[PDB]
Amino acid sequence: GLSDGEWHLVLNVWGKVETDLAGHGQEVLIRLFKSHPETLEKFDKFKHLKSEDDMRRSEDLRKHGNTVLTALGGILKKKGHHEAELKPLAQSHATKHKIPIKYLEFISEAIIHVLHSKHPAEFGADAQAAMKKALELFRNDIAAKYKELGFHG
Numbered sequence: 175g176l177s178d179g180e181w182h183l184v185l186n187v188w189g190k191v192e193t194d195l196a197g198h199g200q201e202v203l204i205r206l207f208k209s210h211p212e213t214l215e216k217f218d219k220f221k222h223l224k225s226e227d228d229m230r231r232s233e234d235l236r237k238h239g240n241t242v243l244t245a246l247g248g249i250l251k252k253k254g255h256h257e258a259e260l261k262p263l264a265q266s267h268a269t270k271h272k273i274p275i276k277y278l279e280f281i282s283e284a285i286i287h288v289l290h291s292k293h294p295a296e297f298g299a300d301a302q303a304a305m306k307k308a309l310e311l312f313r314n315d316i317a318a319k320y321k322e323l324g325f326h327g
């Protein structure tokens with residue numbers, strides 16, 4: 175399974191493709207948003223904006239991009255337990271920016287494709303796989319947390 179090697183690989187590749195903090199975060203955020211405008215909606219953060227250029231290269235956007243980029247770092251690293259202070263994020267989302275269904279799947283997917291494309295020319299099939307699979311893992315964890323000791327019912 176996934177294992178050490180796999181994990182490392184994914185992690186590194188990610189890290190490499192990512193490298194560009196600001197850009198990285200912003201791009202991801204924008205896509206997600208335009209991808210799943212549901213995102214736009216949830217965002218009370220920014221919404222005066224809602225167009226091509228606006229998302230393309232927006233102040234706030236970029237700002238969030240970094241935070242986004244940065245955070246994931248941990249989750250994947252632990253290369254055993256992205257549970258750094260991942261709980262924190264989880265709680266956060268639970269309360270405000272909930273893990274709205276497919277939302278995360280989308281995020282994950284988009285991020286995946288984005289990266290590979292950006293700083294290839296890995297795509298290394300095996301690599302692509304983990305990457306996506308990795309996001310999957312993350313997602314599963316967060317939700318379990320949420321439902322079972324976050325709110326749930």
Ligand code: HEM
Binds near residue numbers: 213242
């Ligand atoms: C891997 C995915 C995500 C990571 C690691 C993440 C992380 C962060 C972080 C570290 C914060 C700073 C405050 C807090 O914590 O909450 C933030 C805030 C926030 N995120 Fe996320 N985020 C992700 C996904 C999402 C998604 C998918 C959305 C909505 C679909 C979302 C909506 C928010 C909102 C609304 C805030 C606060 C808005 C504001 O700041 O103003 N986030 N997120």
